[PDB]
Amino acid sequence: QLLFNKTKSVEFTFGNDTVVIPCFVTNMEAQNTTEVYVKWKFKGRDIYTFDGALNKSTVPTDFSSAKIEVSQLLKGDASLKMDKSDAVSHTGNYTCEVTELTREGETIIELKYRV
């Protein structure tokens, strides 16, 4: 498996212009991003995917601001960024799934709106 440096939950307020959901793989060995695939899942759907082989990001229209920083991916950082309006209307548990060639792993983070 791919192994993760895990966070159980992150909190945000209305003051957060962009919300980050962390995801950090501790044993990434990829030398090219064509080897990597990333899926972020929320309530039974992929709300962001990155296909490395095609270099194609895909989000649904209600997560239109969702993205990762592909330049950090080979360091094992697969953290998801989105704007506050997409974040506030989609609180709950997110699943970060990372694949590198044949190795895979996932982890879950709870996104919480707090005052």
Partner 1 sequence: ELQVIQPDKSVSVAAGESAILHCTVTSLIPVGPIQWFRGAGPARELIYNQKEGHFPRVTTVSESTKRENMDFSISISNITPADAGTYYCVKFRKGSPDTEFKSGAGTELSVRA
Minimum distance, C-beta of residue 46 to ligand NAG, in the bound complex (Å):
17
Which token pair is 81? 């960024």
Partner that binds at residue 59, options partner 1, ligand NAG, none, CB closer than 5 to 8 Å by kind: none
Partner that binds at residue 68, options partner 1, ligand NAG, none, CB closer than 5 to 8 Å by kind: none
Q: Residue numbers of the site for ligand NAG (CB under 6 A)?
A: 10, 12, 16, 19-20, 55, 92-93, 110
Strand partners, 104: 99
Minimum distance, C-beta of residue 19 to ligand NAG, in the bound complex (Å):
4
Q: Which residues of 48-84 are buried (b: 16+ CB within 10 A; e: fewer)?
A: bbbebeeeeeebeeebeebbbebeebbebbbbbbbbb
**x-or-dash string of contact with partner 1, 17-56, rule CB under 8 A:** ----------x-xx----xxx-x------x--x-xxx---
Residues in the chain: 115
Which token pair is 28? 């990434």
